[PDB]
Amino acid sequence: TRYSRLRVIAEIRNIVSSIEFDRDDELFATAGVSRCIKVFDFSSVVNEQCPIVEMSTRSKLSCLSWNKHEKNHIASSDYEGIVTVWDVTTRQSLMEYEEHEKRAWSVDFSRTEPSMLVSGSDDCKVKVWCTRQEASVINIDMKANICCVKYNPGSSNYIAVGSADHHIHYYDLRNISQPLHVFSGHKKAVSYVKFLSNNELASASTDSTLRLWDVKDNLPVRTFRGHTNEKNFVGLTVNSEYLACGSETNEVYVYHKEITRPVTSHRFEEEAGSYFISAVCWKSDSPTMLTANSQGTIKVLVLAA
């Protein structure tokens, strides 16, 4: 009730598929179709533009994830299938994991066991990696394309897997024989999974909904509607209270987790339907967020009264 709008506080004037803050919310990184991981200083961006680091890649990038303990390390997944860990100080690749046989859509570094990272691919496998080992530590053969994988924020034993089979597969990595639970409800591929808390999981889908799930009691909680998402990866980011996602109308939407329709939205000639928001990232539990769209424009937005 305290917010009704999103204010633009800074802008960096193609598609960015990932925008992510480092461990201390001091730097953020972008990646996508241009085969370039760019790192920016958040404070500089708000107070001014030039990245402080640029790392060229062989392939287009689908996802980034910063290491939660080695603050200068970042992982990427790319359209070749390769999962790379990078040192943004030296610009060198530290690990190049090459087992996936098709594009990898997602990579996530664990918060609680920071040397562990998980990836998912069109090859229908989930792979768990340790930065001290070259071969994967766990391999989960699934039936359908994997669009997103995410570690539980409280324990590296649990991952949520968003699948093109329309379900979220919630695994205990200590016994991958069967998932702990498979959450049905979305009518299309599950493009994102993100945790609000140890027990609260959100998902996005190209059925134009977000959904909230209780992964302790294995229950559906809430469905969120208002944005348009029938085709693209448009971004999902959550914190303790709010969900934000993109839209194929060139708008960013914000939902409070207790309310099914948006509390606010922001629109970034051509119709709205020609551009889409492609990446979003809250600055932890604050009302500030990073956003990017399919032209490559980046905006810093802040919830306001």
């Binding site: 598609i15 287009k60 359209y79 069109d122 093109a164 085709k231 693209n232 990866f233």
Partner: peptide, 8 residues
């Protein structure tokens, strides 16, 4: 292609 969610 780029940024398009898969199908089965």
């Amino acid at each position: 292609g780029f940024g398009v969610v898969p199908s089965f």
